[PDB]
Amino acid sequence: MADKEAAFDDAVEERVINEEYKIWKKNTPFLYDLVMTHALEWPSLTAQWLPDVTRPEGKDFSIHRLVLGTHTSDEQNHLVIASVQLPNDDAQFDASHYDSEKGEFGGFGSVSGKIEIEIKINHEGEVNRARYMPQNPCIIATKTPSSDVLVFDYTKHPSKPDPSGECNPDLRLRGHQKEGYGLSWNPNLSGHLLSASDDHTICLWDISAVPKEGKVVDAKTIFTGHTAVVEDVSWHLLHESLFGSVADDQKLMIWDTRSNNTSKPSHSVDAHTAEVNCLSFNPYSEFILATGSADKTVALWDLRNLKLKLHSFESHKDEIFQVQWSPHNETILASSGTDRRLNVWDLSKIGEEQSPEDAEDGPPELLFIHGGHTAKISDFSWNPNEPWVICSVSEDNIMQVWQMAENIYND
């Protein structure tokens, strides 16, 4: 009865998905400068580009790397480092993009970039979120279905995993009681890691002095200001004491580590009209952050006056789970979620006068809609070394490395 109408709603929407994908596949030469669709072995709940890029001399490509996880209900889940062949910006545009190999004069053109798996490390349950520490990018922290946050060093592990299945983390970080998804490393303090969880708490560890030899580290500070499930937490990128957290009590809370009150934050906004799932600070604007939520909106915030919302970005059709600023342009925001769309926003076009044809397509700050995933996008990541290149993963084992066309943004 309850699963009868749920399977009725999933079967009507699957024909809407299959009709939307083939229209998107026809529109792919006019929308993108790169499409790399790779079917993964297992679905990934996390995606983040490693910041190192190796560029071989004489070749038109470079090797970029990704931090991936697996989302299996069987007991062989893996922390996965993959490697992507991305073309350089001094390389010639041809038919090597769009996963194509048909030449433009009746034959073969060029090959596309390939995605292989380098390192697999055994993991206690599925990887909810995996993030590298920026001061040492060999250190990757993960989130488990249990209460433990695990810290991995992939140079101290073999590339092929054990068939025994024993997960051996380099550190075991405890302090939570339930699972969670939020994770943030401090870029101005080494080893300061934040984590959000379902036990209404934010934990903070300092692992900068303990050796990475399998010991158990307890939490330095536990922040108990939220009253519901804490979805995401993020450090500020310039000031080392400030961090932000969003939760299921519709609240954005800005904290300070110099405060002694660990149950009351520095500021607190009634941020949305539903559960707030993600936040991201601007890397170029020190007062600006963005929060995304289950009321199909992205909210723009100013830290100097948090009681007034700056802007509401409205084009999504379902619950928004990840928001990320672009690390090359300060006005470029991206967001994804349950509506199988990754929207790219441009806040410099806020307030521009449109035609009524263009008003039906959306607001003028909406720049691009990625319509390539056929399931719910769990996580995405901007490439920090190649501009406008986004990896994005979804629940149907689909990872898409893509870049939009140049005349959309450059005018």
Binding site: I23, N27, D358, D361, L366
Partner: peptide
């Protein structure tokens, strides 16, 4: 054409 297609990726225009 390219900027209007960016905001309507499910438009078939055919």
């Amino acid at each position: 054409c390219t900027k209007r297609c960016a905001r309507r990726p499910y438009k078939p225009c055919a």
